[PDB]
Design a protein around this ligand. Structure first.
Ligand code: BEF
Ligand SMILES: [Mg+2]
Length: 880
């Protein structure tokens, strides 16, 4: 924050080193003191730590207590089933946590393997690991920067600072000390570790190593990035705490009821039998209320959504990440490589003849001026594309010839038509290269460079021909066009041709006057064709989009206004302004600011953290290294296929096809996934509530347990899991994309879903109560069998009613959800397996369970479902 401001001698004196180098004793003492230039990998959570962390869930705690109670009671099989369920849930959660945590290693491969360091007066290829502040490193083209440092001798050095600015653009490096504070991407006189050197030679003095570097700061932010809780995960945690409190209250009520039946009853009833009955009732309540298959069902629905969006070439590493997309309220975005294609292109153009909007794609129909413009654009080129669009040098020349080829006019044919006869490379202050290649029977010299230099050098122009050198009207029009392009943040290069000499004798400075401007071409990183549609859909979906980019203020403003991110002539927030902004000021000015420019990776993490502080599920989407801290910090991080590997790892999603529409598609798929998950959880907990009501009513009447532990485990694991998955297979709501993002504190049972849960559970419990009463009219074992049958069949047929909370199954399509019908049929098969003579004893179903008792129980379950439909109709007609 101060090294770049200080002079080269000042920072040399600060580090106690000279330009010659440092001795071996000094370098080894400085290596032993805060040395070891490398990104220390985080030890990260071991497997056992994650295992014990997964055991802190209230549902897991209640299930563990129930399993221990069953093991003490002698129910070895049911306790082992509960233990296996807990093992499966913990394994699933730990696997998901490991997949999320795979966003590690910080990509230390970005750091250079070697480093040309002059040590003890000798130049050696010392490995970048053994580098210390004070070490003087020589840089050349194609050499990764080993450590952060300040320039003191650099000859036309250019560094691809694509891991802070996020752009593969060769940033020019000058040794002059910066007198004023500049942004992290504008530090001209300071190299940064992990940034490739594109062109030129340089030699700097290291000022930072390991975590003190900017890539070190990025690695530190990645390591300290908060493991965000998924909105489904946080809703389930809150409802799990509530359900654990409710189950503890239910067990307290059970023990109090039994203690009352003993103390207020008679001394004949032994304490041991009553306490044993209380323990069985409490463990049955725990098993029933806790959905043992809930984690598996949620994981399966999330995997279904992940596969659905992987069909669109968007790999979602984290299973809850699709849900996190569904609950997204803010989409933070990078510009270079994420909004734009990270490929410079020519978008606009101008000639004194005029501008025909879009450049014609037919060279046969091309005008003379346009043809000469393209010619003096291609034959003066520096880059090339030969195989699979391989880029030769700077993206500016690549942009020029890509625009030339995009008009169905291959540049290679023109280059072979007009052989190069000498050229001058870039001359720093002289932006004009002015190649002197011989043309077709004209021997005209062609030039290309910056706007201002071209306009100052020449006075002629190509209006219709060799126009007389007047410089008022054409100059005004040219300047107006250039200023308009600059206001559009369009990079401008002006080209011309001179032919007076027609000799081409030497290759040196020539008559830089009278180059006869024929036109100039605009240039910018254009937004992806899918970006505008994605922005329009996100705004229609209530999701605001925020641009966080390393580009200058002008380019970010132009891109935001191009895609409708900002208002008319809005003002973006520079990275410097954000750095000078206290967190309170940023929070006060967060909704109003929609585009951030010239930001550092820590600035991106700061913006994402601030947006998450406002209770909004932030969707940071990026492709560069600078986005990786923000990708990890965001609740959902979205990467691109062409983005860097660290950005792909740090982001939950990876758009392999770089389709920005896939981001809004993921938002919609996640909304549908959360609707289906809420349907499945509502169904599971309505069945659980029915079982709980039946058990409590049996308790208060001194009745036998409606369902044993094995029966409840079977229902919750194989007879509710399949219908819950089927309801997770539900079709998308018609207005799934028009809904505002769901509240982060909405709760799992909200917006009429709690009412449906309560009604369905109450009716299921009432049916099981009536069935148990009818069974007790026969025998307690018959009561258990018929209560279990009624509960299992009511929960099987509850799939139809749980499809929608306002529209009945008869009216939403009874067979529209083929998964629901398949799950209902398979649950019928499973229940028929239960009433098999061999398996009757396992499910406490006596051999006397005749077809009359089955008919009564099945009719009670069907009446429960019919009354559930009737209650749904009464609810959506009367009160909402
Ligand atoms: F590469 Be970006 F636009 F931060
Ligand atoms: Mg980028």
């Amino acid at each position: 924050a101060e090294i770049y401001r200080k002079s080269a001698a000042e920072t040399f004196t600060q580090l106690e080193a000279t330009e010659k180098g440092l001795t071996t004793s000094e370098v080894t003492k400085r290596q032993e003191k805060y040395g070891f230039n490398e990104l220390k990998n985080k030890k990260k959570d071991p497997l056992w730590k994650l295992f014990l962390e997964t055991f802190k869930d209230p549902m897991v705690i209640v299930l563990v207590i129930a399993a221990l109670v069953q093991l003490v009671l002698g129910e070895v099989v049911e306790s082992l089933i509960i233990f296996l369920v807990l093992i499966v849930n913990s394994i699933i959660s730990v696997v998901q946590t490991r997949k999320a945590e795979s966003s590690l290693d910080a990509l230390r491969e970005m750091s250079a393997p070697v480093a040309k360091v002059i040590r003890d007066g000798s130049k050696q290829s010392i490995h970048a690991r053994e580098l210390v502040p004070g070490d003087v490193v020589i840089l050349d083209a194609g050499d990764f920067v080993p450590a952060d440092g300040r320039l003191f001798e650099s000859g036309s050095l250019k560094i691809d600072e694509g891991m802070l600015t996020g752009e593969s653009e060769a940033v020019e490096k000058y040794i002059d000390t910066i007198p004023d504070e500049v942004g992290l991407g504008d530090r001209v006189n300071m190299v940064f570790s992990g940034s490739l050197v594109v062109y030129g030679r340089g030699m700097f003095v290291v000022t930072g190593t390991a975590s003190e570097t900017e890539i070190g700061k990025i690695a530190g932010l990645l390591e300290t990035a908060e493991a965000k809780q998924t909105p489904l995960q946080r809703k389930l945690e809150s409802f799990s705490k509530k359900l654990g409190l409710g189950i503890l209250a239910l067990c307290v009520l059970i023990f109090a009821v039994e203690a009352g039946r003993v103390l207020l009853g008679d001394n004949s009833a032994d304490m041991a039998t009553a306490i044993l009955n209380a323990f069985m009732f409490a463990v049955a309540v725990a098993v029933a209320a806790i959905p043992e298959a809930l984690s598996s069902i949620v994981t399966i629905v999330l995997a279904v959504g992940t596969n659905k969006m992987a069909k669109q070439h968007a790999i979602i590493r984290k299973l809850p990440a699709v849900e996190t997309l569904g609950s997204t309220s803010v989409i933070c975005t990078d510009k270079t490589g994420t909004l734009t294609q990270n490929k410079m292109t020519v978008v606009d153009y101008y000639l004194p003849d005029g501008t025909k909007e879009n450049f014609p794609e037919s060279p046969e129909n091309w005008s003379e001026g346009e043809r000469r413009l393209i010619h003096i654009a291609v034959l003066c080129n520096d880059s090339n594309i030969n195989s699979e669009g391989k880029e030769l040098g700077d993206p500016t020349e690549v942009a020029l010839i890509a625009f030339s080829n995009k008009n169905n006019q291959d540049y290679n044919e023109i280059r072979e038509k007009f052989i190069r006869e000498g050229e001058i490379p870039f001359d720093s202050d002289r932006k004009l290269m002015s190649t002197l290649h011989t043309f077709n029977e004209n021997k005209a010299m062609l030039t290309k460079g910056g706007p201002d230099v071209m306009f100052a050098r020449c006075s002629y122009v190509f209006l219709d021909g060799e126009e007389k050198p007047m410089t008022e009207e054409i100059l005004a029009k040219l300047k107006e066009t250039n200023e308009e392009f600059s206001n559009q943040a369009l990079r401008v290069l002006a080209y011309g041709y001179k032919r007076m000499p027609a000799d081409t004798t030497e290759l040196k400075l020539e008559d830089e006057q009278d180059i006869v401007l024929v036109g100039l071409t605009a240039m910018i990183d254009p937004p992806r064709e899918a970006v505008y549609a994605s922005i329009e859909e996100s705004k229609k979906a209530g999701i605001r989009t925020v641009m966080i980019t390393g580009d200058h203020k002008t380019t970010a403003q132009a891109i935001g206004r191009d895609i409708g991110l900002m208002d008319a002539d809005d003002i973006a927030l520079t990275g410097q302004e954000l750095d000078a902004m206290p967190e309170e000021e940023l929070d006060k000015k967060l909704e109003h600011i929609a585009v951030y420019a010239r930001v550092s990776p820590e600035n991106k993490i700061r913006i994402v953290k601030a947006w998450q502080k406002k209770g909004k599920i932030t969707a940071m989407t990026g492709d560069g290294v600078n986005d990786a801290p923000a990708l990890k910090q965001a609740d959902i991080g979205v990467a691109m296929g062409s983005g860097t590997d660290v950005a792909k790892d740090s982001a939950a999603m990876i758009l392999t096809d770089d389709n920005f529409v896939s981001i809004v598609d993921a938002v919609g798929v996640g909304r549908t996934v959360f609707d289906n998950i809420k349907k499945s959880i509502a169904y599971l907990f309505a069945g659980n509530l029915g079982a709980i009501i039946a058990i409590l009513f049996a308790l208060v009447l001194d009745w036998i347990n409606p369902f044993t532990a094995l029966q409840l485990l079977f229902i919750n694991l194989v007879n509710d899991s399949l219908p819950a998955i089927a309801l997770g297979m539900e079709k998308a709501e018609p207005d799934v994309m028009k809904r505002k993002p769901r509240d982060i504190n909405e709760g799992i049972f909200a917006g009429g879903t709690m009412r449906a849960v309560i009604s369905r559970g109450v009716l299921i419990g009432i049916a099981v109560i009536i069935s148990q009463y009818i069974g007790m009219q026969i025998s307690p074992e018959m009561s258990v069998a018929m209560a279990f049958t009624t509960l299992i069949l009511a929960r099987t047929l509850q799939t139809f009613a749980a499809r929608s909370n306002v529209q009945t199954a008869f009216g939403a399509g009874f067979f529209s959800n083929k998964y629901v019908i398949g799950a209902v049929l398979l649950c019928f098969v499973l229940y028929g397996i239960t009433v098999l003579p061999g398996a009757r004893e396992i499910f406490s179903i006596p051999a006397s369970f005749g077809l009359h008792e089955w008919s009564i129980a099945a009719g009670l379950a069907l009446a429960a479902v019919v009354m559930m439909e009737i209650i749904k109709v009464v609810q959506n007609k009367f009160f909402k």
